[PDB]
Paper text:
Mitochondrial NADH [reduced form of NAD+ (nicotinamide adenine dinucleotide)]:ubiquinone oxidoreductase [complex I (CI)] is a large multisubunit enzyme located in the inner mitochondrial membrane where, together with the other electron transport chain complexes, it maintains the proton-motive force and the NADH/NAD+ redox balance that are required for adenosine 5′-triphosphate generation and a host of metabolic processes (1–3). The process catalyzed by CI comprises a redox reaction coupled to proton translocation across the inner mitochondrial membrane. In the hydrophilic domain, two electrons are passed from NADH to ubiquinone [typically ubiquinone-10 (Q10)] via a flavin mononucleotide (FMN) and an extended chain of iron-sulfur (FeS) clusters, forming ubiquinol, which is reoxidized to sustain the electron transport chain and reduce O2 to H2O. Here, we report the structure of isolated CI from the yeast Pichia pastoris (Pp-CI) and identify distinct closed and open states that resemble those of mammalian CI.
During analysis, it quickly became apparent that the sample was compositionally heterogeneous, with some particles lacking the FMN-containing flavoprotein subcomplex (NDUFV1 and NDUFV2, responsible for NADH oxidation) and some particles exhibiting an unexpected density that formed a bridge between the two major arms of the L-shaped enzyme. Our further analyses thus focus on states 1 and 3 (which both contain the flavoprotein subcomplex, with and without the bridge subunit, respectively) that refined to final resolutions of 2.8 and 3.3 Å, respectively. The TMH1–2ND3 loop is well ordered and occludes C52ND3 from thiol-labeling agents. Therefore, we now refer to state 1 as the closed state of Pp-CI. The closed state shows ordered loops, a buried C52ND3, and α-helical TMH3ND6 that allows a continuous chain of protonatable groups to form along the membrane arm (black arrow). Notably, a hitherto-unknown protein (NUQM) completes an interdomain bridge in only the closed state, implying that NUQM stabilizes it by restricting the conformational changes of opening. The presence of NUQM therefore correlates directly with the conformation of the enzyme’s resting state, which suggested that it stabilizes the closed conformation and its interaction with the complex is stabilized by it. The comparison supports the assignment of the cryo-EM NUQM-bound closed state to the biochemically defined active resting state. When NUQM is bound, the enzyme adopts the canonical closed resting state that has been observed in many structures of CI from both prokaryotes and eukaryotes, whereas when NUQM is absent, the enzyme adopts a more “open” resting state with an increased apparent angle between the hydrophilic and membrane domains. Our observation of a population of Pp-CI in the closed resting state is consistent with its capacity to perform RET, like the mammalian enzyme and CI from P. denitrificans.
Numbering used by the authors:
A (entry chain K): 1 to 80
B (entry chain N): 1 to 347, 365 to 523
C (entry chain M): 1 to 491
D (entry chain O): 1 to 192
E (entry chain h): 123 to 182
F (entry chain d): 1 to 75
Write the structure that this text describes.
């Protein structure tokens, strides 16, 4: 069911919904890293997992700021 | 030098008052920083010492002669770009003040230069993910530096989403390699190069192919380059390719150890499509930056053929091609920024709107450049004929060396296709030359008192006032003659490329 | 003492013209004295430069040994080796001779920018001349395609109404085809590590690889001679390019394909050249026959001359691919003779009639001998030279090329004799119309051929007659060089 | 390849600064004043605003000197480092280094010096700082620890070279020198 | 001479899974942050370590 | 080496001369610019010659090892 690109329907029809999809996709990689590190008893993989969480948080902030300013520009006359 | 000086500039810029003059002088400070960085790097890093390859910072980074050459190229090209914002490009306040409006312009560039230089040096999958995001985030900020521009913010929104998906693919590939092997250091992974899924590295390359606008992911790159300001498009369309292509060559160098034929075919398939879209795509377009975006896609495809072959001749071909293409890229965008002073002023059909961010936006805005400035027009013609591949310009030798690597490794189909694509792309390349000069003899006896340059006041009616500032005109003059007169020193330059080794030794 | 002096002097010549004309361009609103009389003092300097270029090769000609086998005047310059043999020496002289002739043709018939035109013409003459004295494939290709950039701008700026279409045709036809020749050159540098003339001539490659290399090289050559069916660009370019551009294109550029066969095919791909010879003859014979019949239906005056060059160079291709000395010498003789008669026909059509009436349609002209007797004398004489009438160099070239073709292939090579009839059919039908009947009702009486146009016609006619009556001036130089190109094992 | 004797693969920050030649301070001073000079030079080449020369404000001159001060020191630091690495002529540095090491050995003191870092941290610190000068132009990182991974053998300091006989240095065996790995694991093999 | 020179440089030596360059100069595990002596599965003795493979410098 | 640096200085004059045409000034405008331009590329030419001379030494040393590798292959 994945090869027919079923996930393209589960994503909503708003720009912020695309942002949510990216966070979920990146979160799946981090969960996989924790899964492998825990089985191996490897703290190096848990270091990688922590880095992925911190880096993904930075990505969300930058993307939101661009989207905030993009919404600001349209409602920017502010004559009142 | 970069990191320490960046912190000082960050604090200093926020302390002094907000003004165009201080921002321009701060931009010159950034120019000195990059120049000092180049001097320090050249003092300690040499080609001979780095031939073996030296690990750094607990083997997280690995520098060799191949990596060092690109870093030196990155610093040099960044110096030429800062000259645009550190000096006048047209001499007119209404046009030039855009570069001096944003104080964080030089700060964001210094952030990206750190990412660009460290990316080819990555030796761990963890630091690979960290650095690729460091470079990607800096590009998003630079694309959105003009936050009062609707197109600039829209492009950055597009850039963020496409790059984030590519970063996820890159992260997904590295995580899958860790699951199979449990190791994060690349050199440790090379011990198991014959026991890991080699198509996981193809997933890694797919993320890198997105970040360089390769087909089928070309569409976002063309849209972003056309909408972004010319001063921003000049950076974001060249700098990411300097570092990512170098990293792709290293990854392909490791992949060729197992020599997976299926891996080569998939990359060949993407190169074949990129040559089709790169050539036929630019045939029917009216924007100059849209035309250059297709030109960028086509030339990256030519370099990828050298990268895919990954042999001794590929090192010579790639190093030469990336250096000469960057110089041609700088020269063309430098001329485009300057020639905005020859635009006629209305004093209407098609209701054409031109903004201050992209004064030159259409190919036909280059009309009568042969009459307006014969030396600048010839400089553009030399650059365009280099992209075509007319010998003995720098462009011909780049394609000549790429063909050598492609045909030596047996890529007969791609070599023939790249030459058909070159002929097809010559059509839109020649269109630029047609606009510049083909109406010279009919418009020689014409009067133009409505040009932008005509609005510039004179000093005393006796001073010989040049139309162009000293710095930008000198850079165009230097780059044009290097492209034209490469035959004089071609033999020695290739000998320098002979000594760039990626673990060849003997 | 040749390439170094030729490049340095011409580069200094280019700089000298640029400094003088572009000194006062700084929105001075000036008048200046160099621009007086349509920039006479700038045209004169460029004309002097072309004359000096001829003297440069003459100094090396004095030391040329016709009894010495191998390249002479071997020189290292720009990391490139340069040399001269019998075949190269004559082709260089022809290229440099047409320099002043091309400049003098557009002396006072350009709308402006004479300095740009003069520099472009001299640049093209030197670049084409250097292409005959390079000693490797890479250097051959560099000069083979370097002429495209000056020529593309020259046609697009100084061209006729359809100059835009002509500029696209010459740029794309001659580049897309030459790139296939570059592929064969790249293959040589991959498997032999060198593209030197002497080095690659001694290497025998596999019969399949020679077939692939021959096809790649012949595509670039066949488009440039040109041969059917890749010839359609040439009539468009000639009918729209300026007269000086037509002279260089018809007199020099089309001869690079014949010289390319000498350097790139015969001594290095000798085994596959024998196999390809029947195919080359079939293409060239059809090129000769079809072009002559197509010329009978053309209405543009300059297009008719353009198609005539295609038929003659088909004979040159036939002669040069014959595996005997008679065919090879005749092909080289015909190239030199065509290098003078063909520009003269363009001068008569595109330089004399066009500069007065500005219309190239054939329906406007008839009975021109009534008020232009001097024009008709040269038109008739050059028409007979173009048709291969004896006492002209074209006859010597055509007869030996036909004879060499019959020696190479008695059955199908005999068809080359049809050039004697077919060439007279279209050339005389044009000349008979232009001189016969009453003077045209659509033309006003005006000046006959002036002194400047008399000079151009006379000094293009003189070499043709000298070569035609005493071709031993040319044969003696060529005999030793041409004998090396023959491949045969008689036992 | 111009190669010389290897002194220290990871020289200490104090050792690099102490071994500065007079030219190293000269290049440090030129870097300090060069950056303000370049701002003057850039204005002379093309003024920031207008067509006439205008001196940059003193606030720009102060920050430019600070940038040049760190830039000059980094250049000097790299030049001195190559002498320890052997990439540059270091006969002056070899003689000074050998005298210091022999003096420390004669006192039964480690040439590297006592460290607050345990055996793992000393090795870890060396891995982070070794060859980090290659990226000193990108970001700084210095060896500010007394670790024992310097890529040399203390045995080569026992042989007497020319001009060192008059030094009158007596060298005890390495196993009797404090703060050395060969003289620490006496009771336990896993604890120094 | 030029043809001979280019043949040497342009020749790419064969690489496979049995012969290729790995840039590791030492064996890890001599010191761990804590609990260095684990299940005694580390059989590599650093007191009797054989000489490592050294990288080749063609310019030296 | 003087002829080499003379050529580099000649190249620097060409760059300045080409700059004058771009800026639309007479070629005698500020003649001191040619002195600055020539000396700038002389400094680049001096460094370029050192780069090429150093590269020739490195190439020869590597060629020796390549010939040894080729001899083993041809046996
Ligand atoms: C101390 C004051 C100082 O040195 O900076 C002057 C500056 C003067 O402030 P001001 O009087 O309002 O400025 C008036 C004029 O604009 C002042 O104009 P200005 O041009 O004279 O100041 C600009 C300044 C540029 O300022 C900086 O670059 C400081 C960057 C520090 C980070 O450039 C310089 O003056 C160079 C000398 C001072 C900086 C030397 C720092 C060496 C690096 C350490 O003070 C600061 O920059 C404050 C930033 C640091 C605050 C304290 C942060 C402490 C963090 C660690 C805490 C835990 C320990
Ligand atoms: C993209 C961004 C990337 C990130 C970039 C961000 C920046 C990261 C890089 C930052 C720098 C790298 C450091 C990373 C963390 C290292 C931490 C560490 O290893 O501490 C171990 C270290 C203990 O290791 P240890 O084996 O016992 O060695 C003791 C001394 O360090 C060794 O004793 P000594 O013989 O060297 O001399 C002791 C005494 C000097 O007394 C003497 O007797 C020296 C005699 C010669 C004097 C020559 C003067 C040279 C200095 C001018 O004081 C010193 O000179 C210590 C040298 C450090 C000078 C200040 C550092 C300047 C760096 C800028 O802990 C410390 O207390 C280090 C003190 C140095 C100050 C902090 C260094 C960071 C600032
Ligand atoms: C600014 C130009 C500075 C040129 C410095 C070139 C350089 O970085 O060194 C050459 C480098 C290899 O250097 P390396 O082998 O490591 O050490 C030996 C150095 N003699 O090789 C390289 O990697 C350099 C590759 C880039 C080559 C750039 C060529 C110059 C670009 C044109 C400069 C235009 C100058 C415009 C002037 C504007 C100001 C008016
Ligand atoms: C002697 C000298 C010879 C020199 C030239 C040699 C090459 C000659 C090429 C001959 C083929 C092209 C000439 C004929 C094509 C005419 C196109 C055409 O008539 O219309 C386009 C056609 C749709 O037809 P339509 O738009 O409705 O036009 C009305 C027709 N009654 O649209 C179509 O249906 C075309 C099919 C769809 C597009 C297919 C594209 C796939 C790739 C094609 C090859 C490109 C290879 C490029 C390689 C480099 C780039 C990878
Ligand atoms: C304006 C005019 C221009 C020119 C017009 C066309 C004329 C030129 C082409 C026509 C041919 C010219 C003469 C060629 C024939 C001469 C050779 C000959 O003598 O014919 C007989 C000969 C066979 O000799 P034989 O000894 O019997 O062979 C024994 C083998 N054991 O060899 C043969 O078997 C004869 C070969 C077959 C005949 C070929 C002739 C047809 C050519 C058609 C061309 C297209 C029309
Ligand atoms: C200590 C850090 C601050 C340096 C103080 C010395 C200084 O800046 O001198 C002042 C002078 C500015 O001149 P001015 O503003 O006209 O004098 C006051 C007029 N009422 O400043 C100048 O003239 C500019 C010349 C450079 C000043 C020294 C810059 C280096 C600052 C220390 C860097 C240390 C790292
Ligand atoms: C007086 C100082 C002038 C420079 C002196 C010098 O050493 O330059 C080298 C060369 C002089 O010749 P030489 O050193 O004897 O070695 C032959 C290399 N040409 O002098 C030169 O090579 C200068 C050549 C400049 C002209 C080259 C421009 C190329 C023209 C376009 C290419 C056309 C052919 C392809
Ligand atoms: C053999 C090596 C030669 C290489 C260098 C040649 C000179 C380059 C031009 C610099 C000077 C300049 O641009 O000057 C312009 C000159 C002078 O023309 P003008 O009528 O006075 O100019 C008009 C000004 N008016 C109207 C006020 C008088 O015209 C040229 O452009 C001629 C030379 C270029 C011809 C070919 C162009 C494409 C080259 C592509 C290379 C692959
Ligand atoms: C192997 C030997 C190769 C020889 C050359 C190959 C054919 C060259 C055609 C000239 C085109 C030209 O001139 O481009 C210009 C022409 C303009 O057309 P126009 O004349 O104005 O009429 C048409 C315009 N209308 C209808 C308005 C009147 O635009 C084209 O056609 C654009 C497509 C050209 C692509 C050429 C790529 C060739 C790939 C390599 C061979 C497979
Ligand atoms: C209006 C203007 C129109 C155009 C006019 C053109 C006039 C040309 C001027 C004469 C030049 C001259 O004489 O060059 C000669 C000099 C000295 O050569 P060498 O040191 O022996 O080098 C060896 C030369 N071999 C190999 C032929 C023997 O080379 C130069 O300096 C080269 C100039 C740089 C060319 C650009 C390519 C190199 C870029 C390096 C960084 C990437
Ligand atoms: C040792 C190596 C460096 C060379 C020494 C000189 C450095 C420059 C400082 C002098 C002052 C200056 O540049 O002054 C500025 C001048 C003049 O500009 P203008 O437009 O006439 O100004 C108008 C002034 N009026 C009104 C009086 C006329 O600009 C130039 O001449 C530009 C060329 C820069 C120097 C050459 C650099 C070459 C680098 C290329 C190598 C990769």
């Amino acid at each position: 069911m994945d090869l027919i690109l079923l996930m393209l329907v589960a994503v909503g029809l708003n720009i912020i919904d695309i942002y949510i999809m990216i966070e979920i996709l990146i979160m799946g990689c981090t969960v996989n890293t924790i899964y492998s590190a825990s089985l191996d008893n490897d703290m190096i993989g848990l270091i990688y997992s922590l880095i992925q969480i911190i880096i993904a948080g930075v990505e969300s902030a930058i993307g939101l700021s661009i989207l905030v300013n993009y919404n600001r520009i349209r409602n920017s006359e502010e004559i009142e | 030098m970069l990191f320490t000086s960046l912190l000082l500039i960050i604090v200093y810029g926020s302390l002094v008052n907000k003004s165009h003059l201080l921002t321009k002088l701060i931009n010159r400070l950034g120019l000195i920083i990059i120049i000092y960085t180049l001097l320090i790097h050249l003092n300690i890093n040499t080609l001979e010492n780095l031939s073996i390859g030296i690990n750094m910072f607990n083997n997280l980074l690995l520098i060799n002669s191949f990596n060092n050459t690109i870093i030196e190229l990155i610093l040099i090209i960044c110096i030429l770009y800062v000259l645009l914002i550190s000096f006048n490009i047209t001499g007119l306040s209404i046009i030039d003040n855009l570069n001096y409006s944003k104080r964080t312009f030089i700060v964001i560039v210094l952030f990206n230069i750190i990412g660009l230089t460290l990316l080819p040096l990555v030796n761990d999958i963890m630091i690979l993910f960290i650095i690729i995001e460091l470079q990607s985030y800096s590009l998003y900020l630079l694309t959105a530096i003009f936050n009062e521009s609707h197109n600039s913010t829209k492009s950055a929104l597009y850039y963020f989403i496409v790059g984030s998906i590519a970063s996820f693919i890159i992260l997904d590939a590295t995580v899958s390699i860790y699951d199979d092997l449990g190791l994060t250091n690349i050199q440790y992974i090379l011990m198991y190069i014959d026991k890991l899924e080699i198509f996981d590295l193809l997933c890694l390359l797919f993320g890198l192919f997105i970040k360089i606008g390769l087909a089928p992911f070309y569409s976002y790159s063309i849209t972003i380059y056309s909408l972004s300001p010319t001063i921003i498009t000049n950076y974001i369309s060249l700098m990411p390719k300097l570092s990512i292509l170098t990293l792709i060559y290293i990854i392909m160098h490791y992949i060729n150890i197992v020599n997976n034929t299926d891996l080569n075919y998939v990359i060949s398939f993407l190169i074949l499509i990129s040559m089709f879209i790169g050539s036929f795509g630019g045939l029917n377009v009216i924007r100059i930056k849209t035309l250059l975006a297709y030109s960028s896609l086509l030339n990256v495809s030519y370099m990828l053929l050298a990268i895919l072959s990954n042999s001794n001749e590929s090192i010579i071909a790639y190093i030469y091609y990336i250096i000469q293409y960057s110089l041609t890229h700088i020269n063309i965008f430098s001329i485009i920024l300057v020639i905005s002073i020859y635009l006629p002023i209305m004093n209407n059909m098609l209701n054409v709107m031109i903004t201050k961010y992209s004064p030159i936006e259409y190919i036909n805005q280059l009309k009568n450049l042969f009459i307006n400035n014969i030396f600048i027009a010839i400089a553009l013609c030399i650059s365009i004929f280099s992209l075509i591949g007319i010998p003995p310009l720098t462009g011909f030798y780049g394609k000549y060396l790429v063909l050598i690597s492609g045909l030596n490794n047996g890529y007969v189909l791609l070599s023939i296709v790249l030459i058909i694509a070159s002929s097809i792309s010559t059509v839109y390349y020649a269109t630029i030359l047609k606009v510049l000069s083909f109406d010279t003899l009919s418009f020689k006896d014409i009067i133009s008192n409505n040009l932008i340059i005509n609005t510039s006041p004179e000093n005393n009616n006796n001073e010989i006032k040049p139309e162009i500032s000293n710095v930008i005109s000198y850079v165009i003059s230097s780059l044009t003659l290097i492209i034209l007169l490469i035959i004089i020193q071609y033999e020695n330059i290739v000998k320098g490329a002979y000594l760039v080794l990626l673990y060849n030794w003997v | 003492m040749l390439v170094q002096n030729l490049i340095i002097f011409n580069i200094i010549g280019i700089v000298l013209l640029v400094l003088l004309n572009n000194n006062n361009n700084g929105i001075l609103n000036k008048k200046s004295l160099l621009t007086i009389k349509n920039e006479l003092k700038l045209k004169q300097i460029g004309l002097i430069i072309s004359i000096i270029n001829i003297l440069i090769i003459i100094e090396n000609w004095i030391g040329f040994n016709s009894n010495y086998y191998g390249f002479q005047n071997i020189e290292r310059f720009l990391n490139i080796y340069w040399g001269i043999d019998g075949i190269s020496l004559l082709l260089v002289l022809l290229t440099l001779i047409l320099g002043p002739i091309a400049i003098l043709s557009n002396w006072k018939n350009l709308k402006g920018y004479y300095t740009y035109y003069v520099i472009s013409i001299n640049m093209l003459v030197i670049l084409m001349a250097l292409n005959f004295i390079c000693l490797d494939l890479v250097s051959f290709y560099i000069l083979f395609e370097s002429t495209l950039a000056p020529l593309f701008l020259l046609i697009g700026i100084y061209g006729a109404n359809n100059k835009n279409k002509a500029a696209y045709y010459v740029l794309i036809y001659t580049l897309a085809s030459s790139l296939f020749m570059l592929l064969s050159i790249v293959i040589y540098y991959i498997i032999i590590n060198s593209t030197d003339y002497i080095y690659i001539n001694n290497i025998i490659l596999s019969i399949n690889l020679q077939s692939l290399l021959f096809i790649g090289i012949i595509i670039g050559i066949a488009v440039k001679t040109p041969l059917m069916p890749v010839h359609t660009w040439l009539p468009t370019v000639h009918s729209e390019s300026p007269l000086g551009g037509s002279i260089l294109l018809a007199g020099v550029i089309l001869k690079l394909a014949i010289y390319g066969v000498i350097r790139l095919l015969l001594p290095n791909l000798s085994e596959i050249s024998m196999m390809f010879t029947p195919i080359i003859y079939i293409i060239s014979i059809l090129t000769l026959i079809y072009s002559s019949l197509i010329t009978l239906k053309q209405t543009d005056l300059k297009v008719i001359i353009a198609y005539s060059s295609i038929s003659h160079l088909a004979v040159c291709m036939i002669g040069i691919f014959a595996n005997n000395l008679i065919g090879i010498n005749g092909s080289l003789i015909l190239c030199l003779a065509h290098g003078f008669v063909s520009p003269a026909l363009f001068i008569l059509v595109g330089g004399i009639l066009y500069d007065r009436y500005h219309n190239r349609l054939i329906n406007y002209y008839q009975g021109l001998s009534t008020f232009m007797p001097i024009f008709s004398i040269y038109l008739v004489v050059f028409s007979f030279c173009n048709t291969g009438t004896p006492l002209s160099g074209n006859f010597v070239g055509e007869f030996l090329s036909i004879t060499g073709a019959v020696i190479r292939h008695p059955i199908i090579g005999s068809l080359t004799a049809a050039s004697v009839l077919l060439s007279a059919c279209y050339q005389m039908k044009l000349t008979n119309r232009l001189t016969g009947s009453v003077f045209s009702q659509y033309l006003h009486i005006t000046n006959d051929v002036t002194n400047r146009e008399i000079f151009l016609l006379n000094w293009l006619l003189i070499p043709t007659i000298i070569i035609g009556i005493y071709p031993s001036f040319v044969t003696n130089i060529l005999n030793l060089a041409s004998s090396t190109l023959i491949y045969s094992v008689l036992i | 390849m111009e190669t010389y004797e290897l002194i220290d693969s990871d020289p200490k920050f104090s050792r690099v600064v102490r071994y500065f030649r007079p030219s190293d301070y000269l290049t440090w001073a030129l870097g300090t004043i060069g950056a303000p000079g370049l701002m003057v030079l850039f204005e002379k080449i093309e003024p920031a605003k207008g067509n006439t020369f205008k001196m940059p404000p003193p606030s720009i001159m102060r920050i430019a000197t600070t940038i040049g001060f760190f830039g000059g020191f980094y250049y000097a630091y790299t030049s001195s480092t190559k002498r320890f690495w052997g990439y540059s002529e270091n006969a002056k540095e070899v003689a000074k280094d050998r005298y210091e090491v022999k003096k420390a050995l004669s006192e039964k003191k480690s040439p590297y010096g006592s460290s607050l870092l345990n055996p793992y941290q000393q090795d870890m610190s060396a891995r982070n700082s070794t060859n980090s000068q290659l990226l000193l132009a990108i970001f700084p990182w210095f060896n500010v620890a007394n670790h024992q991974s310097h890529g040399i053998d203390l045995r080569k300091y026992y042989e007497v070279r020319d001009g060192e006989e008059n030094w009158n240095f007596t060298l005890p065996p390495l196993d009797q020198v404090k703060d050395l790995d060969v003289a620490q694991y006496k009771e336990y093999s896993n604890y120094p | 001479s030029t043809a001979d020179l280019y043949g040497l440089i342009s020749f790419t030596p064969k690489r496979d899974i049995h012969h290729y360059v790995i840039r590791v100069d030492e064996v890890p595990g001599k010191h761990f942050p804590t609990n260095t002596t684990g299940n005694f599965g580390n059989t590599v003795d650093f007191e009797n370590l054989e000489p490592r493979r050294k990288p080749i410098n063609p310019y030296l | 080496m003087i002829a080499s640096l003379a050529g580099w200085g000649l190249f620097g004059v060409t760059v300045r001369a080409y700059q004058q045409g771009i800026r639309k000034v007479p070629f005698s405008y500020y003649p001191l610019g040619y002195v600055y331009s020539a000396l700038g590329w002389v400094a680049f030419g001096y460094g370029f010659n050192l780069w090429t001379e150093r590269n020739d030494k490195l190439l020869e040393k590597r060629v020796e090892k390549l010939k040894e590798s080729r001899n083993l292959r041809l046996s």
